[PDB]
Design a protein around this ligand. Structure first.
Ligand code: NA
Length: 157
């Protein structure tokens, strides 16, 4: 049923949230805080979907997107130094792919400001203008807020 597939996804998301919260002690203090924020977004997806304020395709697309960002948090948790440009460029490209995949699956989520932010993210991926400290801070800023903007449809629909 549509109602059974709905209960299936809510069950998946709850098991997913438990798995990662149960590992939060592996994370640095800062990364724990990022995990709490991402799990709040997962809660927003569940409640919006429970209340039929989003459909299953969109909810699952947002879940997939956050799944990737949560795993990247664990990936980065053993990194404290500034990234090489090679590592940085990989990170920017990967995040852009996750954005594009999400918008392909949930095209109602795009906005002018998300499109503009994609372009500013692309411009960071440029070795000639790369400033190891500033470029990384700017990437992390754009990434934090872009995740918030892409998930905003589930916050108070
Ligand atoms: Na949608």
């Amino acid at each position: 049923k549509n109602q059974m597939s709905k209960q299936q996804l809510l069950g998946e998301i709850q098991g997913f949230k438990e798995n990662y919260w149960n590992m939060k002690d592996l994370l640095t203090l800062t990364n724990r805080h990022h995990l709490r924020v991402f799990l709040e977004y997962l809660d927003n997806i569940c409640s919006a979907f429970k209340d039929d304020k989003t459909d299953e395709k969109s909810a699952r697309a947002a879940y997939d997107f956050l799944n990737a960002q949560i795993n990247k948090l664990f990936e980065d948790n053993s990194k404290n130094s500034k990234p090489s440009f090679e590592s940085f460029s990989e990170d920017v490209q990967r995040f852009l792919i996750h954005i594009d995949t999400y918008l392909m699956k949930n095209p109602s989520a795009c906005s002018n400001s998300i499109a503009s932010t994609i372009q500013l993210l692309k411009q960071l991926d440029n070795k000639k203008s790369f400033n190891p400290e500033q470029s990384f801070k700017d990437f992390c800023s754009y990434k934090e807020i872009t995740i918030q903007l892409l998930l905003k449809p589930f916050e108070t629909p």
